[PDB]
């Protein structure tokens, strides 16, 4: 607290807040994720050091950029370069024109961030809309993957039981079966996110969490009419490759970047405005706040 001035709250985590801050000598603005100590558990300092270590490692145009890590008695401070564009999903629902080409561009940037994690031995484990930020429209509006509080370090392509973590709507079948897992769990979540980007509601849902899990473990998603009839088959195909329940057969981020809907978007992705997706996304966002 000797070096930064804190300003307004930007968002909330389970045991954290993110506030805009300024380094008092330089006048430079940043964002500080401030992790509280309400909950104390066995390996606290190992978890905090891991999050900082993973954040220090990852330097990519589509990943948040760590500046400093500061340990205090009651709080821990992870200081990042500030991005001012807000959450991706809140940006989309404010658009007046939003098409498959726009979803494809978003997913491509997400895929670049996820591929960069995996090449560096990092599994994020908590890919979800609220962890996707935006650089300012004045700065190019690059998608920024954020919050590595749940992320793990893996040795190459070796897989193991790394614990139960993540967000229910985005959990992978291998995690719900308590099977060993790894990098593919992020491509599963990427597939859930892509589905929502196209029609504005999730592929797996039930107010009963037990039935939600049963649906994920079955991998039983579909493309109902009429809203999916206007979606290109190539977009559906990419979802199919990400949402296969055998993680061995799931497309990797490096492969997904070569999918025609991603890398030939001007000729493969539809340019039709999807106003129903905007309408449903607004509801989707509002429910997740409550
Ligand atoms: C992302 C995870 N959060 C829970 C912790 C979600 C659930 C809630 N939202 C926010 O935390 C949020 C964050 C930021 C923000 C701006 N620079 N920056 C730089 C680094 C980081 C982070 C690094 C590691 C974790 S966050 N975050 C930011 N800007 C926001 N917005 C809304 C307003 O329009 C500007 C909202």
Swiss-Prot record:
ATP binds at residues 10-18, 33. Expressed in cardiac muscle and skeletal muscle. Isoform Delta 2, isoform Delta 6, isoform Delta 6 and isoform Delta 10 are expressed in cardiac muscle. Isoform Delta 2 is expressed in skeletal muscle. The active site is at residue 126. GO terms for cellular component: axon initial segment; cochlear hair cell ribbon synapse; cytoplasm; intercalated disc; neuromuscular junction; neuronal cell body; nucleus; postsynaptic cytosol. Transmembrane segments: none annotated. It is found in: Cell membrane, Sarcolemma; Sarcoplasmic reticulum membrane. One of its GO terms (molecular function) is calmodulin binding. Activated by Ca(2+)/calmodulin. Binding of calmodulin results in conformational change that relieves intrasteric autoinhibition and allows autophosphorylation of Thr-277 which turns the kinase in a constitutively active form and confers to the kinase a Ca(2+)-independent activity. Its main location: membrane. Residues 4-262 form the Protein kinase domain. Belongs to the protein kinase superfamily. CAMK Ser/Thr protein kinase family. CaMK subfamily. Mice overexpressing CaMK2D develop a dilated cardiomyopathy, enlarged myocytes with reduced contractility and altered Ca(2+) handling, and die prematurely in PubMed:12676814. Calcium/calmodulin-dependent protein kinase involved in the regulation of Ca(2+) homeostatis and excitation-contraction coupling (ECC) in heart by targeting ion channels, transporters and accessory proteins involved in Ca(2+) influx into the myocyte, Ca(2+) release from the sarcoplasmic reticulum (SR), SR Ca(2+) uptake and Na(+) and K(+) channel transport. Targets also transcription factors and signaling molecules to regulate heart function. In its activated form, is involved in the pathogenesis of dilated cardiomyopathy and heart failure. This is Calcium/calmodulin-dependent protein kinase type II subunit delta. It comes from Mus musculus. The gene is Camk2d.
């Amino acid at each position: 607290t000797d070096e930064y001035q804190l300003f307004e709250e930007l968002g909330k985590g389970a045991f954290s807040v993110v506030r805009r801050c300024m380094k008092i000598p330089t006048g430079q603005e940043y964002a500080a994720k401030i992790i509280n100590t309400k909950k104390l558990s066995a390996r606290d300092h190992q978890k905090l050091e891991r999050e900082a270590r993973i954040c220090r490692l990852l330097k990519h145009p589509n990943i948040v950029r760590l500046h400093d890590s500061i340990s205090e008695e009651g709080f821990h401070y992870l200081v990042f370069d500030l991005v001012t564009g807000g959450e991706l999903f809140e940006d989309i629902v404010a658009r007046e024109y939003y098409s498959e080409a726009d979803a494809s561009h978003c997913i491509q940037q997400i895929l670049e961030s996820v591929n960069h994690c995996h090449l560096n031995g990092i599994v994020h484990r908590d890919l979800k809309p609220e962890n996707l930020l935006l650089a300012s429209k004045s700065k190019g509006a690059a998608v920024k993957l954020a919050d590595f509080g749940l992320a793990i370090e893996v040795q190459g392509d070796q897989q193991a039981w790394f614990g139960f973590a993540g967000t229910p709507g985005y959990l992978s079948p291998e995690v719900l079966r308590k099977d060993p897992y790894g990098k593919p769990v992020d491509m599963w979540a990427c597939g859930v996110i892509l589905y929502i980007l196209l029609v504005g509601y999730p592929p797996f849902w039930d107010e009963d969490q037990h039935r939600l899990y049963q649906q994920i473990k079955a991998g039983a998603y579909d493309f109902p009419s009429p809203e999916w009839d206007t979606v290109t088959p190539e977009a559906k195909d990419l979802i199919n490759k990400m949402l296969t329940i055998n993680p061995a057969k799931r497309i990797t981020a490096s492969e997904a970047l070569k999918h025609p809907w991603i890398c030939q978007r001007s000729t493969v992705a539809s340019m039709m405005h999807r106003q129903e997706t905007v309408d449903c996304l607004k509801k989707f966002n509002a429910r997740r706040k409550l």
